[PDB]
Amino acid sequence: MTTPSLSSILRHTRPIFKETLRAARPTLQNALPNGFRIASESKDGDTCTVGVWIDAGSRWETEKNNGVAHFLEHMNFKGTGKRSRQDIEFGMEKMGAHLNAYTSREHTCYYVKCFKKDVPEAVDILADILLNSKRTEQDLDAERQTIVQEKEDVEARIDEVLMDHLHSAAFEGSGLGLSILGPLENIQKSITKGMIDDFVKTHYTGPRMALVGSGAVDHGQLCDLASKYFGALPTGQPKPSGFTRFLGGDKRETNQLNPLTHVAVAFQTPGISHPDAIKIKVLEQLLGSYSRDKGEAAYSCFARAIVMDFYDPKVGQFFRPNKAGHNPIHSLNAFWAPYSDVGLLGFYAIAEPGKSYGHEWENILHYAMRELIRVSRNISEEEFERAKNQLKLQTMLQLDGTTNIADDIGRQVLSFGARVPLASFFEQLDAISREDLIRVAHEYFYDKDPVVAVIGDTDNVPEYDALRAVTYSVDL
Amino acid sequence: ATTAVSGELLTKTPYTRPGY
Amino acid sequence: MNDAPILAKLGLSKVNTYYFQRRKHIFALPITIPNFPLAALGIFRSTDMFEERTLERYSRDEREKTLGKAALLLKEAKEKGNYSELVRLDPTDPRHPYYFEHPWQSALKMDTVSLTPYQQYLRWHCLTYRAMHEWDRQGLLYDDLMQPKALATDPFLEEAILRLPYNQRVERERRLSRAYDLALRREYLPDEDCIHPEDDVAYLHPYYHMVVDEHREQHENPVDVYSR
Amino acid sequence: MNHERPWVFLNKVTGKWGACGWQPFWKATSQSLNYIPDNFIALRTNGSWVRNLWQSSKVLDRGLNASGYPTVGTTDWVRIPLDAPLEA
């Protein structure tokens, strides 16, 4: 390597962050006397996304009907009293559109992307499937095998299996810690028409449903259609308000034949509607993310602390140098999963298992927990500013396209009761204090019980007890 | 639990675990 | 025994070889310590009739039995042409020449008319002594407790484990881990999950015996007297 | 300091409303001559919430169907924000 490196001698120019704030049309919202909500954000264009967001996921199941939400999702597409499955598909095809159904732990949505001239027909089909769909036993028995195949397919996604493990470990004894699809024995035998009908009756109520429109749409037309179709929904009982206890612990799946090891460590945080929501988001952006293509170019104190020990020569006075052959980290990502009651804030690390009985994962978790303690004690102003700017950009990056905007509108309407204007959100983001952020970090990280999920060669990943002993330091 | 020569599994004879 | 009819037609005994066990020597040599001095000689012996008795495999009678069963298999293969199949039988198949059965796998359905009073005592002893140890309540087979050691390892045993099919190896390991978890609390499986004596199959003894024979092969056909 | 902007409680079954907010307070001592306190109840605002409350009083007392607003725990009270005037 005879070529010199002038970057070590030169004076480099630092780019600075300067945000762009385009004023979007305000999100209008109305509510029928039934309580069904109607939210709409209009923008110049030729295509619009129209959907229904429902506030009933798999969070409300007691292991006797686990997966009934997904069964219901599959059953809504099998025909209604008026139309058949062939008729619904024909209507969608004539409109040249696709009807997408998505089911999560605390939200479901059925949405259609169409032209502005197909809005009434799309809303008609949505109401038809949601309200008037007949769910007979025969069809229920004809979808069991397709759902079994879907279960077997989703069991093969390592990231999804890892997050399911994390939730099963964290929330045991409540539906929030159950898998979306449910046990195989439940898919094949237990779930029944009675369970599906009970779920629909209990959770598809007026005040827990919203009709969302994004793009070239008319709010008045949407309101008229919503009154026409969704005005008869019952004002059923309120959303259940129970206590979901967080259980620190570990869920470790051993598979020594896997090429990569996935380790997620999470801590309990308050819900999404807590005033600490923005501070937790800023913390998530403070920990940052790292990908292997960056090498040593990690922009956060966290990822960097975990990466530079595989480039450090580790020369000591009385010991031989111990430098890693290569950097084994595939990726590091900070995540926050919130829910109306609770939350999981943590990191997700993917790296090679390494030599058996090595020290790679010991070092990774050592430095990860040290950085958590450090941010609990002190945070620098420059990194605070970096985190806030990155939160601004990340919040803006999620609003690409009418479908994404509609998804954001629906989720915020179901969670906070109304969409928070971006400016308003940003107004609350420049009022955060470094001391407040430090207090939030110390409240939930220091000397707390974490939940760990591991998939891969658990021969090298430290066990829970050790991990519980590194959330605090003797010096403090 | 092993098969017979014909390959079919026979029924296990009645058995009461010996007492103390 | 499930093998008995075959043994019936080869002129052998339908009774387990667990009976007929006898002491032929006074001194047990080579003397092995850490026995106490007199015990180190082996004049007085204490046995519970559940020893391995591996060194009794070096006999002409056992080889004759094995080759008789193998000749039956080869004759069937010649008649039918399914050689492959007949040489790939699971060693738990009664037609496999190295088929082995624990004494309790047939103690409940034994003939018991040809048995000496001592052999009837042996049968009752086999059943009750199996009951005493309570490895049937741990959801475990006897051959699961044949495990190698870090030092002074039983060489044959290790090979006997590597010859097991992958699924049977994994099931053995899973049973051992479940028994470990149970033993943490000294807990047993539900009474309906107790292992019936006829279900306590000797799935590793055939592999053990095959390995022993294969290891002795080269000794009896030496390249030279002073050869490794 | 950064707390919630003032809101309006409204009880449904009783049909009775009322403003509310977070009042900071500190131990009394000498004041400062060169300082007129800023907006502390509604931080970082031009104090329009008073105008919104005054305008919305007629709407609320007349009877408002607030089924589209979040509740407060398991009680019969719902929160109406005073960011913008209430017309419904």
Added chain:
Amino acid sequence: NAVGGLATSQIRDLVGNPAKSGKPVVKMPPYLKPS
């Protein structure tokens, strides 16, 4: 039934649903049948 001259549904049933090949079946030794 025909969307722009195409019997799409029919085509779907003939094209859109390939068979899925699952894990090979392991023959169970008779001594492992007990649960």
